[PDB]
């Protein structure tokens, strides 16, 4: 019976009837880490450089 109250959808699509009776959105249990390119320039500038690479290194 409890499973009959559980509704699963693979994607962002939800039926209109299911959407119209929603009440509260529970917070996601896990905080999604941001990729390297998602950091703003202020955050990148905030984090200090830790080492000085040699000037003659090819990298």
């Amino acid at each position: 019976t409890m499973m009959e109250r559980l509704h699963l959808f693979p994607d962002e699509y939800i039926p209109e009837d299911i959407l119209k009776n929603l009440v509260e959105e529970l917070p996601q249990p896990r905080k999604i880490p941001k990729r390297l390119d998602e950091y703003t320039q202020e955050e990148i500038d905030a984090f200090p450089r830790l080492w000085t690479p040699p000037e003659d290194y090819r990298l």
């Binding site: 959407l19 119209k20 929603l22 509260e24």
Partner: protein
């Protein structure tokens, strides 16, 4: 067992004890034997105990009938209409007095299982819990994933 017997909730008669206390015992009918050996304690109770007991309970009418009987009995009738018959067969005067006093203190309701050891007509003062008691409201009451002014 509890499943094989009836049950009820804790209650009183006419909300007894709220405005005033009314003794629920209404009538006691004794049946003693003049010559019966099993009625020896019953005769002792009538000689010295029932007269003083009647003084302390002016609201209870006590009927003592002396007739031949093998098993003396006392019948207690209450205001709510319940009738309880108890045997005083071969009981001492002290045991009869304890039994009679026990009948006077009872409310007359059925002596069966009581589901809850408490009763209240107003269990809540601040408001009974509902799923929205601790849920904050949102602006314009928008549901999750709802678009306003499409």
């Amino acid at each position: 067992t509890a499943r094989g017997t009836p049950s009820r909730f804790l209650a009183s008669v006419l909300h007894n004890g709220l405005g005033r206390y009314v003794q629920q015992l209404q009538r006691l009918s004794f049946s003693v034997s003049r010559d019966g050996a099993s009625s020896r304690g019953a005769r002792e109770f009538v000689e010295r105990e029932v007269i003083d007991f009647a003084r302390r309970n002016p609201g209870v009418v006590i009927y003592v009938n002396s007739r031949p009987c093998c098993v003396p009995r006392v019948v207690a009738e209450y205001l709510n209409g319940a009738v309880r018959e108890e045997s005083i067969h071969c009981k001492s005067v002290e045991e009869i007095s304890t039994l009679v006093q026990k009948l006077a203190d009872q409310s007359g309701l059925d002596v069966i299982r009581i589901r809850k050891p408490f009763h209240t007509d107003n269990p809540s003062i601040q408001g009974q819990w509902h799923p929205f008691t601790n849920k904050p409201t949102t602006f314009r009451g928008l549901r999750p994933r709802e678009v306003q002014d499409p």
